[PDB]
Amino acid sequence: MTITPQNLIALLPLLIVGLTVVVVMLSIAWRRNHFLNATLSVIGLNAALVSLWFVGQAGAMDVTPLMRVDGFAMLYTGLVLLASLATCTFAYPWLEGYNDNKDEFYLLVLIAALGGILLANANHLASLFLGIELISLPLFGLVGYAFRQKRSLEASIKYTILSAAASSFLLFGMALVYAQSGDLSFVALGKNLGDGMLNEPLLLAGFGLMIVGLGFKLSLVPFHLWTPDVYQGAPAPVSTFLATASKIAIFGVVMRLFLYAPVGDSEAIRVVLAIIAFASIIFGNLMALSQTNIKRLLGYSSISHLGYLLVALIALQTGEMSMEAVGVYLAGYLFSSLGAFGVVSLMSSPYRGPDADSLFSYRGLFWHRPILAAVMTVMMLSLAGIPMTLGFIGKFYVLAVGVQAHLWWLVGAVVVGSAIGLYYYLRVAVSLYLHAPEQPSNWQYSAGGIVVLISALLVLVLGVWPQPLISIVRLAMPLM
Amino acid sequence: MLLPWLILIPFIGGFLCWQTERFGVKVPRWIALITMGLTLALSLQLWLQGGYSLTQSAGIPQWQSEFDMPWIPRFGISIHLAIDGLSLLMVVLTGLLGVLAVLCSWKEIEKYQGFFHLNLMWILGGVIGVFLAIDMFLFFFFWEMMLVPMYFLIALWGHKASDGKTRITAATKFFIYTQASGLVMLIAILALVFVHYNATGVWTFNYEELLNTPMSSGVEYLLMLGFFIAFAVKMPVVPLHGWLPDAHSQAPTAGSVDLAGILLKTAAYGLLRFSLPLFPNASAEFAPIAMWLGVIGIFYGAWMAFAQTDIKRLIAYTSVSHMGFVLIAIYTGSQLAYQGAVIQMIAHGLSAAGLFILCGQLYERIHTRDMRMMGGLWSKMKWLPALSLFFAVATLGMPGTGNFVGEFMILFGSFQVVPVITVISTFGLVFASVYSLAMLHRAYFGKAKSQIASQELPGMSLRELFMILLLVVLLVLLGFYPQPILDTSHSAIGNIQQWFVNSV
Amino acid sequence: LLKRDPLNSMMNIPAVLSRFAGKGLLLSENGYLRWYVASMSIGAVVVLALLMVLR
Amino acid sequence: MIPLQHGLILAAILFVLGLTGLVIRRNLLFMLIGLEIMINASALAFVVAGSYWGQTDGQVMYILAISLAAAEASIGLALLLQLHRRRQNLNIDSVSEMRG
């Protein structure tokens, strides 16, 4: 369909991020300046947030056969933009330690944010596929940005090969779904069925291959083995972006796909997703038990937390507040992961070159970085689902949503995985305060410290008083 | 209106203890003392003005004081506090033990002392919030909120003679036990709230409205089992007791941390307030299993206490056996056994506080806890062995101390309800005398078994001696004149019992 | 017979099972990209077979 | 007159052969070749489905698919060249340093 000016108003964050990509690229073409290009990128992302306010002042409508903009899309756009802004802020000191070109980083972060926004508004299989690829390829660049280092090149090769394979799986599944149902829009996948014929074998096989691709992207068992290697090998701001923005955007488009598709309330797909959620929770928590590397530990943590989110997704076509639970949990998980990966990024910045080691060495962090240790232990308590943290509010939402839908196996899985998480998260948070024998001064490092401190304060305050976040998420509802 | 201040004065006091460390390294102890004294004074003022002795039973709900303020209105969650006689007795007891814990941390002045006092005050405020909250989410929030300062007190400020990894192991075991049991309770709470929402149509976590929720016997049994698992971890009920002696042994060696966090029994109160009224039919069906678990707890705790070579683990298993007696008392339908349970909870608090303070003083004098390395200490110390003799005599169940009053009222009511269990439990009293005399013989009587015991040790200070003598006076007065406590708890206990027996 | 707490040990054995299961699951993280592709294809086979069985 | 089943079966055969080539080959270049076979097979499946319905959306999905194929072939060959110039070895089992 044609694009009216109101439709152009509803595309405002997408347009502003694309224009920021063009402007930053032309500025690099003018002169290779780190500060100006980083500033232009963060100005473009903040302008995209203000454009989200302007989009909210407009209506909720279908801008294309491809895109649909509503409060759901606005919430996920805001989450992706916050994650991208935090990634740029954490990236500046680390890139200040870098030696090669250091503005293509911000260009790639902007293009990945553009893909996240497209997935936030995606109402079509074409827009879903394109948003996944626009997330993925800049992350191929960003994970191997320090390709002279062995670990970053290894993580880049693994992520590139496995994401190309997963995109092939997703595209073949989309092709089988389109072979069954003549339309590629979300609301028409399974529409031409009735009288108990919703489980068409070709439609289920197509959704299975799409589940393979998306479950690679979400680090769900058994498509999870890439996660600790890529999280450990990637640069720490890249690990921050990969943990927050990619997972949030892909899970949002999966939420909308299962909300809108008439095949979403299928018993077979629900049982398969229940198996995947159970295995993801238990396996991620069990594999994170004996990890001394903080980044591998957060990779397995991401596996288990996406399992909890999947549990909230399974109850979507039965209950009502599954969308609200996913929103609250995703806000809490975003802020906790931003704090944890930002502490990891700040202590690993500036970049020490490809030859020097990059181990975190979090033991006894309090005796020389007390504020970062306090932020890190708040984040470790939040990822554990401890009360007085927003992670507990998300976990409580997941438990309430599971109890309402009689998903008792998943409820018991959440309880057991939470106990295992208690063990390893408390191990990290108490190793922060022990005594270690042995083993800045610019405002961008201070900006990263302020970002992790504000994330910690948000986690604590919204864990004590979660009503504002619930009220914000509840008014961000999609088209029914 | 004073209940929010009963919770908030410990939190504000802990924050001021943390902040006023810059004014001096020996400053925050005075702030902690002042705030715990303020909390105790406010509890005593609520006791005096409440008129609990003249209150007659009128049925649940019946609150002497109440406070309500919306917290999460989406789920119908509100900060909803209420106090009656049982909650008031528990709040006065935790205020008194908090003052004792501040006084026991005196003359331990190191770096980050203000954060130690902050953790202590937050544990105490969480305990008070557990005793005051009468909606499910706030009760669960206070139930799980105590575990983080407790974990960091055990792991970071713990027993300095340990390996360092043993303290972390004990603290992690405690945290995993209590938090997993709490999560099971949260599942039971959420399922009860959803059953009520399907039955009526309005979201609520309020305890008053969640009463008389129509549900089948199996669902009610499952909800009762979730609540009981959470309370049975912290009661402790065997086999879920294993966190307790490890948490006591690896606790900070002043002994104040035991009184602040481990010594009090919020789980018996939790059973009385949220298990019998919310699920009376399920509790009535579960009563034989719970009473046999109590008998097993009595005998297992006595046998474990006899076999210890460490004093702190001996006192911990003593606590396990006494809580087995209380657990037997709770699942009867006797007002007399419930009053005995209340007296036994208070008496166990006083006697275990005295025993743990005396053990901490003995350890700071002889630098070991092994009873094989100590002996003949009656001839070497001035005050400690005689007071330890008194407190072992009190935990034995001696008439003249409140432990006897509580235990024998429990046994009288239980014999009126279940005679065989009462017979076996009185033989458990014989086993209690056996382990108390074993500890006294191994520690203070005989010949010295090492060179550290063959020396004259310094006497106790005036502060430690006076707070131990305060505990002695309180136990003796509770043994000889327990009537004010019974008159305080009578109306609440009668409400619980009449709700429990009229609905079955 | 009870001087080393037996009930505590039979409540400790879930931690032993969890540690054993974690060590067993960590064998799949061998770092080999061909095994990661193979595990993705195995998961695809399992998901498709479960969907066809459940119908 | 050409069945939809036959075109989809042809695309499935090519996809499975590309996945097998991706798994069994230890050289990274042949892994990239198998990836190209897989993405071309999925694009062929989209073209078959679009031709069955008489819609232009199948060829549009093909165009997006080959845009992805071109860009990720470029990225994968750049990473292959980097691996070759840093190790003088294209064995994918040698680049396995990070492990659980």
Ligand SMILES: CCCCCCCCCCCCCCCCCC(=O)OC[C@H](COP(=O)(O)OCCN)OC(=O)CCCCCCCCCCCCCCCCC
């Ligand atoms: C404080 C609690 C915690 C907050 C955490 C937030 C995390 C996510 C951030 C983005 C969330 C955006 C959610 C927006 C949902 C809006 C849903 C909706 O329908 O809004 C419509 C409303 C106008 O009302 P109405 O009359 O309905 O409009 C239709 C008229 N045709 O229009 C609106 O409501 C407009 C909404 C504009 C939002 C602008 C946001 C700007 C960015 C703020 C960032 C703050 C810093 C956070 C990070 C700290 C450091 C890490």
Ligand SMILES: CCCCCCCCCCCCCCCCCC(=O)OC[C@H](COP(=O)(O)OCCN)OC(=O)CCCCCCCCCCCCCCCCC
């Ligand atoms: C490891 C710890 C975690 C363990 C796993 C999590 C708990 C598992 C609970 C399994 C429950 C099995 C229920 C089987 C029947 C389900 C279908 C059914 O008919 O349910 C009955 C009822 C809904 O039917 P309806 O007609 O609406 O009746 C309303 C009045 N009840 O249903 C309802 O009204 C609600 C039913 C609620 C069931 C209990 C939920 C609370 C669980 C408490 C803790 C776990 C059990 C005890 C501890 C075990 C050991 C850890």
Ligand SMILES: CCCCCCCCCCCCCCCCCC(=O)OC[C@H](COP(=O)(O)OCCN)OC(=O)CCCCCCCCCCCCCCCCC
């Ligand atoms: C009576 C039956 C009915 C009631 C059931 C009630 C269930 C909830 C309450 C009981 C929970 C029991 C938990 C037992 C384990 C407690 C944790 C523990 O012991 O941690 C210490 C230990 C670390 O110490 P260490 O072994 O020295 O170090 C090895 C690593 N270097 O840690 C480790 O070795 C690894 C610890 C991994 C994480 C903890 C284990 C979680 C297991 C699932 C928890 C839920 C269990 C549900 C019920 C199961 C059957 C009872």
Ligand SMILES: CCCCCCCCCCCCCCCCCC(=O)OC[C@H](COP(=O)(O)OCCN)OC(=O)CCCCCCCCCCCCCCCCC
């Ligand atoms: C890592 C490895 C280790 C960690 C993981 C280990 C396993 C963890 C999970 C353990 C718990 C498993 C699930 C237990 C609950 C089973 C629920 C069930 O079977 O419900 C069926 C039925 C539901 O009620 P329904 O019949 O529908 O009611 C309508 C009319 N009556 O129910 C009923 O009708 C009532 C049934 C009551 C009896 C079943 C509950 C048994 C609970 C066992 C634990 C408690 C035992 C007693 C207390 C011990 C001390 C705490």
Ligand SMILES: CCCCCCCCCCCCCCCCCCCC
């Ligand atoms: C309610 C928030 C809980 C999480 C944050 C915890 C950190 C608070 C601020 C830092 C305080 C650190 C104190 C460390 C004392 C270590 C003493 C060791 C020697 C005894």
Ligand SMILES: CCCCCCCCCCCCCCCCCCCC
């Ligand atoms: C290795 C970790 C394994 C964790 C397993 C957790 C299992 C928790 C208990 C689940 C119990 C589910 C019972 C469902 C009964 C449904 C009955 C329906 C009747 C209509």
